[PDB]
Write a protein that binds this DNA or RNA. Structure first.
Lengths: 252, 167
RNA sequence: UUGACCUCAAAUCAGGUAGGAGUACCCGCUGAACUUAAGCAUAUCAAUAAGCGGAGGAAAAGAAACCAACCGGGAUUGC
RNA sequence: AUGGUGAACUAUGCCUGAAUAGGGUGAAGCCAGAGGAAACUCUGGUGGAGGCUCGUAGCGGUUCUGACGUGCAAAUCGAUC
RNA sequence: AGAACUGGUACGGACAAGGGGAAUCUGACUGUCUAAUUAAAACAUAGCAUUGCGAUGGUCAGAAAGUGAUGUUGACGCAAUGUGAUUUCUGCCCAGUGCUCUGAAUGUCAAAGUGAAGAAAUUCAACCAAGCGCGGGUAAACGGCGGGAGUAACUAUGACUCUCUUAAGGUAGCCAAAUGCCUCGUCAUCUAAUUAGUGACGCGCAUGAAUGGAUUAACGAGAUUCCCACUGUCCCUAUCUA
RNA sequence: UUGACAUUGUGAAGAGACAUAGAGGGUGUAGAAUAAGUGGGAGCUUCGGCGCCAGUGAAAUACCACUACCUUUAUAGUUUCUUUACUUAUUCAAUGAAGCGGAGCUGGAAUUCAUUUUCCACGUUCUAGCAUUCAAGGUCCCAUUCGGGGCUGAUCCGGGUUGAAGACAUUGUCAGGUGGGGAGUUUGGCUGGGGCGGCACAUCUGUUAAACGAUAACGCAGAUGUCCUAAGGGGGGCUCAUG
RNA sequence: GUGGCCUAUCGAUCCUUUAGUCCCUCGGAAUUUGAGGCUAGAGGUGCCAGAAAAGUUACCACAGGGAUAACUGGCUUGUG
C-alpha cells in the first residue's frame, strides 16, 4: 500500500494544466507551396517575453492566402532583430542574418529555430527531431543530414525544415547560481511540479528497500533495472559510469 | 591485457611490438579507447586520433565521449610556452596547486612526448613566431601575412594546430 | 454535347418500434473470502453469497447421430 | 473477501477575491564639496532596497508542567514566548 | 536644540514593553506537518555530483484501444535518488554482492517445423531465439580503507626485502632586497671622489605562524556550564483584599 | 522481453553446412612406395594372380569394421538469412484535399554527331508604409443594359493534396528466465525467554579433507554389516604355558 | 552327527523400476500392445514389525497467568 513518490502520475489533478500564465503554443500555421523549397518569409514585431522562462515570443501573424484572415499566432522570437524586421530567406535568392532555410540549401553553421523534423507538415506527427535552428553543419550527400550536439548523441535525418536563424538569452541563466533563494513553489508552478527530490534517512523506515534503518547508509544498489520491475524504480536507472568532470578541457 | 600490464623498458619493447601489431571495427575501437584512457590516466596523439575517428563515425563509445566532453587548448598554451622556451618553470606553473608553488620553489626532468623530450634536452644544454602570436589570439592576421610574405609549398597550402603538428 | 436497375443517405406525415421498477422460481455469461484440514499449496466450502441484463406467465430442457446386450428398446422434468 | 455511496472541517494542485499597527539599522544608482597625473579613495542629503531586526490581529500552541478532567470544553481559560 | 524658576535629591510617575554579556558539541537563517502525550540535531530551499534522454524512444496510471498527465517543453527544458550557505568538500584499488552491455554466440537450450523404427500410441538424437557463464566500466550507489607487488608447493603458509602520505623530545623559510624609521655608523666590492648600487651577520618599530595527528561569522521557543546586576526560593515563620 | 505457424500475396531471388549409396588424396626419417594410434595373419570366386616373394627392419602391402574427411556434384525439397519499384487489408497530423509530382505550347547556363535520350525552372525578400470581394485587359451572347451566363487567364491524367513507413508494427491461447507493486500462506520446544553464519555425531591407515587442532558422509580404490572352503563331525594316540 | 562346550547368528507400507503364470482386465460382440491386481526383488530413513516440521519484524489491538507450562550455571562463589 505504501507507494513511493515516483508512481503518482495516474490521478489527473495535481499534474494537469497549471500554466495560466502562458498563452499559446509555438507550432507554425498551415503549410503550402511557400513554406518549403522556394520562398518563405516570416515576420517579428511585438517581442513579448515567453511566459514561464527566459525566451522571446513574437506575434507572427501571416495574412492567410486562402482566406482574408489574420489570426493572431504567438510564435518564437529571436535576439538580434529590432521592433520589426521581415525575413530575407530565398532559396533562389540569397542569405543574410536571421533567415529561414531547410537543412539542405545551406552550408555548415546554420542555427535555425525549432518547429518540425519532417519534410514540413505544420507540426509533424512526430518531434523526435531537433529543438530548432540550433544546428551546426549538415551533409551535402543527398537529402540526408548528420547533426551533432555536445550532449553526446548522433542523428541522421532529412534536410527540410522551417527554422529561422536567431538566438535566445538562455546562456548564463543556468550558469549563474540561484543566489537570492526562495524558489521551488513558484519555480515549478509552471506546467506541473518536479523539484522536491526528496530525502529522509527515516522518511519511510520499516521499508526502505534501498537501505537506511537508523543510520545514514544505503544497502541495495540504487541503480534500478529498466526491464525488471516497475514497482521499485526509485533512483538511478541503468547506470554505467561515475566520475568528476573538471573545468579544464583541452582534450582530443 | 596489453595496455593492462602496459601500465616498462621491456614495456615499450614488446610494446611497439604488439603496438605496430594491433596497428573500421569499433570493438577494437573502444578497446583502444579505454586503452589510451588508462593510458593518459597513469595513442594520446593516436588518442585524439581515434578521437576524431569516432568523430566522423548507449555504451562505451558514448560514455567515453561524455567524459571527454565533461595537445588541444593545452597544446596551444604550452605551445607558446615551448615557443619562448627554445626561443620556463614560471610559465608551466601559470599554465597549471599548493604544490604548484611547491614547484615554484633533472628533477623537473623526471617531473614533467617527442616535443617534451626535445624541449627538456635543449633547456638542460642551455642551463614561426607569427604562428606564435597567431595561436595566441585581425591585427594578428596582420602581422601574420606580414612576416608571411616577409616545404614552403605545403606551407602556404586550429588548422594551425595541425600546422604546429607538421612543424 | 443527353433519360433507367444495384449499393450508400436525408424529415415535424398515415401506419410501427426502443430506453425500466417489483421480481418467488428458473436460465445464459463472468467472478471471491471465511469454516474443516495427522503444518502450508491441491481439494472441500463452490459451476456459491452479492450485483447486472433479457425473455416468459411457469422457465430451462425435451418428439432421438438417445438409452441396451436383452423377453430388443418407444419423448422431457420432478417425488 | 464481495457488492455500493461522500469533499462544509484537515492535507495537496489549478483558477476566481478580500485583508495585513507604529520603528531602528539604510544596500546599487544619482547630486554637492574636498584630495589625486590616470584607472579612483570618503563624509554629509534624497531615494528605502531585503526569503532582514523588534512588536498586535490573523497564523501558530514550546516554556509557567497551574486550574479542570464521576467528560465546564469529545482537548479549554489566563499569562509568557 | 540651548538658556531659567520651583518641590519629596522629584523627572518614559498608571497602562504598553528585548534582563544581559562571554564558550564547547550539533546545526546556516526564514517556511511546513505530527486534529488529541513528542516543535527536535528531521524534511524543504541556494550550491555541487551521478544515472537516464534523437519522437518508429523512455517514465507514470489503466482490463484494453484510435483514453489522459509529463508535453503551451527541445540538450537552455523534461523524470527519478543522495548531498543541503561560502572557504573546506577521496591518497590508492574494480577479485565478490547490483546495474548497464553496438564487447564475446553453439557448453547448455522447450514447443512448432524437420529427421529413424513403426498398420499405431508413448518415448525420441541433432539444429535455433532468450536467459545463465566469461570480460570491462561503475563504489559523491551499497564495501574495503596500518595499502598495492616479487619471491623452489600444480592451487593451500605469507617470513625477509623494496616503494608510499606506516618514523615520540618542536631545528618551517625569507631577513640593509621595493618592506630597516633609527642609519651619510661596521664588514666586503668599484673609485681621484660617489649620502645612490651589490654581497654577510645582528634585536625584524609595520614580514610569515607552508606542510601535520578530528575547521567557522551572523541568526535561535534545542541542550549543558560560568559571571555581574537583581531576587523573602531556602535559612524561617506570619499578616491584608476581591 | 524472445521465437515458430496463421493473420498475409508472390518465386526472375547473391553466397554455405545435411538427412541412403559408388571413385578421387591418407606423401615424418629410412625402405624407389599410399607401413595413417589399435585389432585381424589360414583367407574370399579355387584352372590361373597376392597366400610369408628378395635388400632393410619396432610396425610390411586383397579381405565384413569404432575414422580425424583438404576440395565438388547429386531426384520430388529445405525452419531462420540484406535486397529498388508496382501493394483493393491496419494505424495516421492537417482536413475550408489550397495552387503538388511525372508528362506537356517555351528561356538561360554547360559542349558539338544531329534533338532535347539527363540536372536548378512553376505570384512577397531594404522598413507594421502598402495588398481581398466570380483578378485590371481581349474574343463569343437576350440590345444599345447602372447587371448576369462559357472558354482563355487558371489546359490534363492521377483522386495515393504539401509531409513517416510498409506485405513493416500492434491484439489473443503457446517450456522457462527479469520483479514482494499487491494478495495468500508460513513462527513446537533447543544457552533459567530470546539474541552471528554454517550444520562437517558413529567403522584401522593413506586418500576423501584448503598443511603442527578438530573434522561426518549406506562416496571412490582391496578387504570389511569381524572370523571359517575344515579352527566341522568321529576314532586312536599324545597331555599344555610360566618358573 | 538338523553345526562350533555355553553365550553373539533381524532391512515396513504407499510411490517408482524389474522378473515370473498364457490366466485375469480388455466394461459396443470378437481380435492385436496396453497404466492399475496376486506372488516374488532392489532402493529412501539402525526413532526397535525400525513414518518428526522451518531458520527475517519490540510498528498495534483482543482473549490470559502465582507450577513465567517452557527440563542441572550464558556472570560472581561458604568453613583458606
Amino acid at each position: 500500500g505504501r507507494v513511493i513518490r515516483n508512481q503518482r502520475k495516474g490521478a489527473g489533478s495535481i499534474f494537469t494544466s497549471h500554466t495560466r500564465l502562458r498563452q499559446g503554443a509555438a507550432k507554425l500555421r498551415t503549410l503550402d507551396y511557400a513554406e518549403r523549397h522556394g520562398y518563405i518569409r516570416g515576420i517579428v514585431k511585438q517581442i513579448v517575453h515567453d511566459s514561464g522562462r527566459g525566451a522571446p515570443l513574437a506575434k507572427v501573424v501571416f495574412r492567410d492566402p486562402y482566406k482574408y484572415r489574420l489570426r493572431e499566432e504567438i510564435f518564437i522570437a529571436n535576439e538580434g532583430v529590432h521592433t520589426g524586421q521581415f525575413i530575407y530567406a530565398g532559396k533562389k535568392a540569397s542569405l543574410n542574418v536571421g533567415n529561414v532555410l531547410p537543412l539542405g540549401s545551406v552550408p555548415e553553421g546554420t542555427i535555425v529555430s525549432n518547429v518540425e523534423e519532417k519534410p514540413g507538415d505544420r507540426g509533424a506527427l512526430a518531434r523526435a527531431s531537433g529543438n530548432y535552428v540550433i544546428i551546426i553543419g549538415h551533409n551535402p550527400d543527398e537529402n540526408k543530414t548528420r547533426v551533432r550536439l555536445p550532449s553526446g548523441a548522433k542523428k541522421v535525418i532529412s534536410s527540410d525544415a522551417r527554422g529561422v536563424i536567431g538566438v535566445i538569452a538562455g546562456g548564463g541563466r543556468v550558469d549563474k547560481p540561484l543566489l537570492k533563494a526562495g524558489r521551488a513553489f513558484h519555480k515549478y508552478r509552471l506546467k506541473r511540479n518536479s523539484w522536491p527530490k526528496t530525502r529522509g534517512v527515516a522518511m519511510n523506515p520499516v521499508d526502505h528497500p534501498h537501505g537506511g534503518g537508523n543510520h545514514q547508509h544505503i544497502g541495495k544498489a540504487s541503480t534500478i533495472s529498466r526491464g525488471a520491475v516497475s514497482g521499485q524504480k526509485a533512483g538511478l536507472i541503468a547506470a554505467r559510469r561515475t566520475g568528476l568532470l573538471r573545468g579544464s578541457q583541452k582534450t582530443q | 591485457i596489453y595496455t593492462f600490464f602496459l601500465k616498462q623498458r621491456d614495456v615499450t619493447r614488446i610494446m611497439s611490438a604488439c603496438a605496430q601489431a594491433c596497428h573500421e571495427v569499433i570493438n577494437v575501437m573502444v578497446r583502444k579507447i579505454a586503452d589510451e584512457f588508462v593510458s593518459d590516466g597513469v595513442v594520446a596523439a593516436a588518442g585524439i586520433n581515434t578521437i576524431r575517428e569516432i568523430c566522423s563515425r548507449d555504451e562505451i563509445l558514448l560514455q567515453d565521449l561524455v567524459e571527454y566532453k565533461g595537445k588541444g587548448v593545452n597544446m596551444a598554451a604550452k605551445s607558446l610556452i615551448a615557443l619562448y622556451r627554445d626561443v620556463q618553470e614560471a610559465k608551466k606553473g601559470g599554465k597549471d596547486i599548493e604544490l604548484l608553488a611547491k614547484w615554484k620553489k633533472e628533477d623537473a626532468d623526471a617531473n614533467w612526448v617527442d616535443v617534451d623530450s626535445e624541449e627538456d634536452d635543449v633547456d638542460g644544454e642551455w642551463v614561426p613566431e607569427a604562428a606564435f602570436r597567431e595561436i595566441a589570439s585581425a591585427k594578428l592576421q596582420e602581422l601574420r601575412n606580414e612576416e608571411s610574405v616577409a616545404v614552403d609549398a605545403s606551407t602556404l597550402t586550429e588548422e594551425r594546430l595541425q600546422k604546429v603538428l607538421e612543424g
